[PDB]
Nucleic acid binder design. Structure first.
Lengths: 145, 146
DNA sequence: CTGAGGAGTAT
DNA sequence: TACTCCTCAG
């Protein structure tokens, strides 16, 4: 269970299945978008996220990615737990997070990002949603095509 | 999408994930226990099943395996002769080979080829219908290790 | 699109 | 047993 770069996985490498990512140690969960671990200490820190579709993530062609937290979608408030919490803790720990994007081979490794901040939003249903702003660490290869 | 043996996959070969089976063309669905195709030409025929646990099915030490159909088990309801279930039934008369993968306490073994000998329906206490398929291992194949 | 479906893993 | 940015055939 590694943090940051994973041996033999280059930026721009592609995959067909979420489990391929598991087999290479890029991202362990088969569905959950957020993957994390426990630090020397006690706390959770994120190690990787997958942005397909589903949650209304804001990504385009920039170094910034807005990622939605998990939970609640009968709708209910999201909770600062598990993945969500892991990500928040990654803000202060300032650790690298692997990012995989889904695509219209359905997944690309997009390199390393840092969690700059988070905040909460309110849909019309009235329920709470977390948003995490991640920025791509400078200096890495760009994406093909 | 092949019927019967798949190139380079030997009886007793093991796997950790349902998707490994997909990558090799042994079994395509990621969760659904039954995999099938359309015959020429052409109704549904089963091509592979996965027996883990969950659907209470009978996997003793023999050449015979009783496999439960999918559906109804959330509120219980009759299973339907559709998709996989139907595919299996049609494999009875077509008499085509079916690949069988067993889960294990690497979590999956390729167990070779079987034929669907018959089916029938059962009734749980809930009152709803469940299908059962009797499959028999085609003679002459390697045995399982351990 | 839509969700049925012998998943996968931590908790 | 909870949970979950799955996967693909209808």
């Amino acid at each position: 269970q590694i943090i940051g770069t994973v041996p033999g996985v280059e930026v721009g490498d592609e995959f067909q299945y979420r489990m391929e990512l598991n087999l290479l140690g890029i991202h362990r969960p088969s569905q959950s978008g957020i993957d994390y671990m426990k630090d020397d200490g006690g706390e959770l820190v994120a190690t990787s996220i997958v942005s397909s579709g589903g949650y209304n993530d804001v990504l385009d062609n920039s170094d910034v990615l807005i990622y939605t937290g998990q939970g609640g979608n009968p709708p209910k408030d999201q909770q600062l737990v598990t993945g969500n919490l892991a990500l928040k803790n990654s803000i202060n720990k300032k650790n690298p997070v692997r990012v995989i994007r889904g695509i219209k081979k359905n997944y690309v490794y997009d390199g390393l990002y840092l969690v700059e901040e988070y905040w909460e939003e309110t849909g019309s249903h009235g329920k709470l949603v977390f948003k995490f702003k991640l920025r791509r660490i400078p200096g890495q290869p760009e994406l093909p095509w």
